[PDB]
Design a protein around this ligand. Structure first.
Ligand SMILES: Nc1nc2c(ncn2[C@@H]2O[C@H](COP(=O)(O)OP(=O)(O)OP(=O)(O)O)[C@@H](O)[C@H]2O)c(=O)[nH]1
Ligand SMILES: [Mg+2]
Lengths: 1056, 170
């Protein structure tokens, strides 16, 4: 009686050590485990009304007793516990803290869940059975409702907890008792006659109901009376209890008491908690299931008839975010907007008689203007859905679309990059990271662009009239004048961002015009409308081009918008726009040097690169359209060629080539030769042809000899730290000279562009053969040179090769080999290494494209030898494979050349290519992978690279063992020369550390074991079994091998 | 000097005790010892406007060991709900912890912390976390193994308690 109080004081005293608290807790737990714990708890709760902590502990004892030992107690003890709980509940007073009343309600509900109504499971239960089932619970609750004000709050807590557990929460006890609990809860609240309508239950149930009129007829009058008296706390309590008893009850109760009117009245009141709970309750009423649809119609009509009230509530909730966001109303604003955004589903069911729908859409639009993006983002999905569905489209067309369009246009900005934008104030509250805000802004702008795209698709004429007005006003504004005057904007300040937003709006309009072709019914009027749309687009394009905009990034966006245009226009109007695209994009910029790698020159280089992509894509899509315009495009390109570098010269030549091939122009062979031969002619140059076999000649052409001269002139010591030594003008000049020399010396990019686009869009087998006859005369002659070039780049990484190189540059070239603007000599060496890697990747891509030519490359007898001997690089004495070449280099080699070159085999040529290629390839791969694994942050990165290489090798094996694998298995398994290296490769793969590689290799072995076991047997017995000796299947394969090998010295060797 | 009673609640093994310890000392314990009862730890912070102290009542996260499973929340002035991102059962229990946490202390600020974010495999993806915005709780992604945001919850609680959003640790 006093030890418990002292222990509680120890537990709650801030001055007690954790050991003292733990000792006191041990004592209290001992008390809790006693047989008569509940009676002591009841005594403590009764006799200590002033001590809140001690009373709560007593109630906790009771709660543990009922909640953890209920099964143990007999009926007498259960009735005693119920009586004690009721006695404690009826004794509630004004001095009981809130958490005491919560605990008392918890006790009451815990007893009720386990004892209320269980007698009803029987038929005509006796008086004793009813009493054991708490037949009087409802009568007691009604009695508890009148004792005093404190008890009335307690009854509300009891109801809240009961209905929350029974219906909202997935409590287990009520899960078992559902069939008799849920009907009982509905019974007490619903009027008796209303209850009889839905349920057919007999009279015995009537004994469990005290108030014939139900409970709603008690709460709702109380709620209205509290609203009249403006009793905030009582209103909040009633809403808390009332918020949990709206989803489940019979709808007739909701309508009869007019709950929704009370909820709206609560909403009008300026009590934040009451408003929030009223919004939650209204949403529950809207989304809850309705058995009778007339009541649902009444509910939605009642909500929509009060759009003025909802607008007033929203206006009240609004606040100024400039100083500080009101955290007591911002959540309520989000709740309100979320509830509003769900109403639009009910629009078609409402007969507009007082402008309800117009007011609703105006309110939704007004909420969309909210400074917070999250608040706005709630309604964005509403606008997209409404525009797509023609059910609402007639209503939007009148009210909002004119204003929604203006909002969407004004809101298509880069919020994060603006200085002190009002939206960012809410960002730090709703998001805990900058990245979160950036991604949400990206999504928000995407959804906004959806709105503008759909508004222009539907109201195309209105949008176009609005668009021209917007563009004319903008480009006359001072910012527009700055944009049209400047040549390089800051890409972060207002002029550029505004212009970019304008061009995004234009892009959205063009996308809408494109969608209109699909959206508009294909009626008789379709052609006239489409011609008008095309004329409007032409006029807009002529308008935009006339501005003579020079800013590259803006000029790239304009070019891409016109690329969208061109999918529709045709004939001469197409050419007038395409020529202006070509000339404007490729216009020179005397104000800047196009080789300094400055941030303002990379913009121009990207601009010129964007056109190549767009022009090539457009040519691929619409070659027939460009057929008759080609005579003029050829002249335009010729006129523009002089002011283009090699890199873009190739792109525009590729555009012309695509038009020539895919458009069905006459004399294709002549034009093809005129375009291609001048570029590929560099391969056949006698100097390059002869010197490409000499490593030293390769070094000199790369310019390393000149670098040695430069280092000597600057007296750069062989060990001098190039990491810090600065680069000078002469260094940049030499680097530019070498790069310009290098690209034209080995036109790998030109070859890969011409071959790739040539074979891009084959339509018929005849066209494929025609192209083969077109590339064969000029690809086979150069294949030795291409493979030699790949050979040199491969041997360039071998340290011994540069041994004869001058010592001063020995460190420079070594830096170049190392993998992973330029201002230091170390960066110069890194850039040279980048040049080497770039040439190595493109020469691989040239080989893959030559593979695409099919029989031209595969059926050639020497191709396997050339390719492998050019990638192998076998040292004279040592068995090293391509010494000094990075593992990443091998990964790229395999992935980009060998896989395409293998999978790309023609099924009629596997009989001539694979036999002379698989043996050597397998030996090389085995030798390489064993060497890489023989050696086994920087080390972790190397491990990961080796894992990736092994994965690629396995993929090659998997892709070799469907239509293709069917023939490849036959080819491999019928030749020992190919099988034995393949078995070696499998044996090496299975044993490697990586788990996935071993697992997949074991699967492969299981797949083909039956076809191979037929000196293969000797190798299996001696190496495969020994090496093997994923786990279970590996053992399964081992046993499968054994069952035959040792069944047919093998067993003795295995035992050894 | 103010002193706010803070109750830290969450499923056992979620890192409540580790988080409290690492705020007491730099050490990041790795061995797991299930707290039994409650651990009271006076934790102090220095801010531009002065000093604040949180009596961090670290509650046991296991039913077998929670002595006064709810009595610890009595007179609490703020609370923190810790759930393990790597384990989705803990997040599933967050509504339960909030439910029986608001029963005792009603209007106190509550912070939901997703602990152990350092690992490469988090079963509770951020996309699946919506309880905090449902109950208007302030949510954070923290790890007492990386000190990713360890101090954020206390800063938010200090701002709410002192009614001084400009308050900042120094
Ligand atoms: N990866 C990772 N693991 C952590 C981190 N913090 C704690 N852990 C691990 O999680 C365990 C949590 O230990 P405790 O904090 O003592 O356990 P608790 O959270 O108090 O749970 P209870 O004691 O049962 O209430 C520790 O043993 C750590 O091994 C973290 O920041 N990152
Ligand atoms: Mg603990």
């Amino acid at each position: 009686a006093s030890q418990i109080v002292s222990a509680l004081d120890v537990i709650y005293s801030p001055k007690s050590n954790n050991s003292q608290r733990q000792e006191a807790q041990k004592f209290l737990d001992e008390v809790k485990l006693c047989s008569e714990s509940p009676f002591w708890g009841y005594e403590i709760a009764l006799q200590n009304p002033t001590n809140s902590i001690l009373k709560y502990f007593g109630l906790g004892l009771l709660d543990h007793a009922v909640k953890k030992n209920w099964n143990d107690y007999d009926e007498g003890k259960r009735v005693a516990l119920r009586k004690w709980v009721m006695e404690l509940n009826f004794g509630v007073q004004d001095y009981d803290t809130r958490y005491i009343k919560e605990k008392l309600a918890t006790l009451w509900v815990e007893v009720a869940k386990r004892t209320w109504g269980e007698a009803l499971k029987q038929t005509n239960p006796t008086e004793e059975q009813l009493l054991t089932s708490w037949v009087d619970m409802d009568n007691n609750l009604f009695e508890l409702w009148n004792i005093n004000q404190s008890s009335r709050e307690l009854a509300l807590i009891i109801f809240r907890i009961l209905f929350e557990d029974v219906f909202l929460l997935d409590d287990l006890i009520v899960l078992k008792r559902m069939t008799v609990i849920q009907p009982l809860c509905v019974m007490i609240v619903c009027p008796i006659e209303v209850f009889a309508i839905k349920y057919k239950f007999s009279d015995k149930w009537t004994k469990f109901k005290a108030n014939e009129e139900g409970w709603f007829s008690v709460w709702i009058p109380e709620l209205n009376n509290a609203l009249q008296q403006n009793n905030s706390e009582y209103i909040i309590r009633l809403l808390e209890t009332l918020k949990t008893c709206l989803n489940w009850p019979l709808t007739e109760v909701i309508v009869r008491n007019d709950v929704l009117s009370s909820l709206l009245t609560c909403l009008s009141s300026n009590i934040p908690r009451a408003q929030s709970m009223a919004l939650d309750s209204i949403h529950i009423l809207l989304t809850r299931p309705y058995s009778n649809e007339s009541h649902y119609q009444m509910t939605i009509d009642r909500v929509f008839d009060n759009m003025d009230l909802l607008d007033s509530v929203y206006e009240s909730l609004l606040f100024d975010p400039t100083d500080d966001i009101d955290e007591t109303k911002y959540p309520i604003i989000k709740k309100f907007v979320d509830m509003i955004s769900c109403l639009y589903v009910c629009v078609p069911k409402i007969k507009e008689t007082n402008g309800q729908i117009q007011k609703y859409f105006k309110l939704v639009l007004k909420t969309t203007y909210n400074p917070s993006l999250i608040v706005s983002g709630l309604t964005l999905d509403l606008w997209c859905t409404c525009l797509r569905n023609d059910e609402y489209l007639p209503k939007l067309e009148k009210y909002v679309i004119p204003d929604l369009l203006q909002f969407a246009a004004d809101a298509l900005v880069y919020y994060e990059q603006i200085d002190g934008h009002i939206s960012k104030k809410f960002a730090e509250i709703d998001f805990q990271s900058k990245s979160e805000f950036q991604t949400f802004c990206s999504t928000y702008r995407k959804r906004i662009r959806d709105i503008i795209r759909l508004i222009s698709c539907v109201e195309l004429d209105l949008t176009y009239d609005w668009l021209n007005n917007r563009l004319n006003n903008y480009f006359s504004s001072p910012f527009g004048q700055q944009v049209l005057s400047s040549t390089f904007l800051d890409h972060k300040l207002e002029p550029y961002l505004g212009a970019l937003s304008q061009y995004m709006i234009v892009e959205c309009f063009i996308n809408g015009c494109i969608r209109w072709k699909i959206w508009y019914p294909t009626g008789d009027d379709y052609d006239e409308k489409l011609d008008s749309i095309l004329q409007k687009l032409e006029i807009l394009s002529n308008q935009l081009i006339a501005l003579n905009l020079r800013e590259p990034l803006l000029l790239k966006k304009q070019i891409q918008n016109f690329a969208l245009f061109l999918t529709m226009l045709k004939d001469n109007v197409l050419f007038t726009l395409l020529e202006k695209i070509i000339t404007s994009a490729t216009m020179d910029y005397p104000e800047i040097n196009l080789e300094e790698r400055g941030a303002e020159s990379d913009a121009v280089r990207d601009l010129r690169y964007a056109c190549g992509i767009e022009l090539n894509r457009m040519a691929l899509l619409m070659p027939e359209s460009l057929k008759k315009i080609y005579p003029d495009l050829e002249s335009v390109i010729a006129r523009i060629m002089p002011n283009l570098s090699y890199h873009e010269k190739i792109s525009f030549k590729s555009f012309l080539l695509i038009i020539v091939l895919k458009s069905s122009l006459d004399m294709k062979e002549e034009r093809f030769a005129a375009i291609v031969d001048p570029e590929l002619l560099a391969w056949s140059d006698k100097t390059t042809v002869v010197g490409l076999s000499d490593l030293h000649w390769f070094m000199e052409r790369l310019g390393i000899v000149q670098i040695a001269e430069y280092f000597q002139r600057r007296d750069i010591d062989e060990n001098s730290d190039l990491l810090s030594i600065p680069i000078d003008d002469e260094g940049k000049e030499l680097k530019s000279e070498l790069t310009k020399r290098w690209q034209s010396l080995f036109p790998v990019r030109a070859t890969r562009m011409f071959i790739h686009y040539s074979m891009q869009s084959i339509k018929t087998d005849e066209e494929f053969k025609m192209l083969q006859d077109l590339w064969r005369p000029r690809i086979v002659p150069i294949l030795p040179y291409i493979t030699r070039l790949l050979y040199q780049l491969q041997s360039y990484h071998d340290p011994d090769n540069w041994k004869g190189l001058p010592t001063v540059v020995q460190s420079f070239v070594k830096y170049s080999t190392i993998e992973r603007a330029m201002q230091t000599l170390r960066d110069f060496a890194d850039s040279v290494g980048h040049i080497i890697r770039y040439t190595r990747e493109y020469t691989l891509l040239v080989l893959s494209a030559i593979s695409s030519l099919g029989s031209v490359f595969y059926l050639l007898d020497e191709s396997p030898d050339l390719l492998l001997n050019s990638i192998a690089i076998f040292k004279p004495g040592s068995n090293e494979i391509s010494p000094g070449v990075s593992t990443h280099g091998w990964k790229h080699i395999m992935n980009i050349a060998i896989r395409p070159i293998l999978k790309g085999c023609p099924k009629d040529c596997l009989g001539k290519f694979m036999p002379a290629f698989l043996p050597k390839l397998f030996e090389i791969l085995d030798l390489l992978l064993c060497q890489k694994w023989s050696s086994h942050t920087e080390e972790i990165l190397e491990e990961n690279l080796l894992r990736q290489l092994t994965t690629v090798v396995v993929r090659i094996v998997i892709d070799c063992v469907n239509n293709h694998q069917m023939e490849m298995r036959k080819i491999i398994f019928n030749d020992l020369n190919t099988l034995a290296p393949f078995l070696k490769l499998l044996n090496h793969l299975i044993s490697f550390k990586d788990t996935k590689c071993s697992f997949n290799s074991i699967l492969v072995m299981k797949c083909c074991l039956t076809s191979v076991l037929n000196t293969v047997d000797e190798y299996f017995t001696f190496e495969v079994m020994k090496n093997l000796l994923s786990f279970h299947e590996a053992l399964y394969a081992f046993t499968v091998i054994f069952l035959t090998l040792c069944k047919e010295s093998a067993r003795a060797f295995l035992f050894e | 000097v103010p002193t706010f009673k803070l109750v830290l609640v969450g499923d056992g093994g979620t890192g409540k005790t580790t988080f409290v310890k690492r705020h007491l000392t730099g050490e990041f314990e790795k061995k797991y010892i299930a707290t039994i009862g409650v651990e009271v730890h006076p934790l102090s912070f220095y801010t531009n406007f002065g000093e604040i102290k949180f009596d961090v009542w670290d509650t046991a996260g296991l039913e077998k060991f929670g002595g006064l499973r709810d009595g610890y929340y009595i007179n609490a002035q703020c609370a923190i709900i810790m759930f393990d991102v790597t384990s989705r059962i803990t997040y599933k229990n967050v509504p339960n912890w909030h439910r029986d946490l608001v029963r005792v202390c009603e209007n106190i600020p509550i912070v939901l912390c997703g602990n152990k974010v350092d690992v490469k495999e988090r079963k509770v993806k951020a996309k699946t976390i919506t309880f905090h915005r449902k109950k208007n709780l302030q949510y954070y992604d923290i790890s007492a193994k990386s000190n990713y945001n360890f101090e954020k919850p206390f800063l938010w609680l200090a701002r709410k308690l002192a009614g001084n959003p400009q308050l900042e640790f120094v």
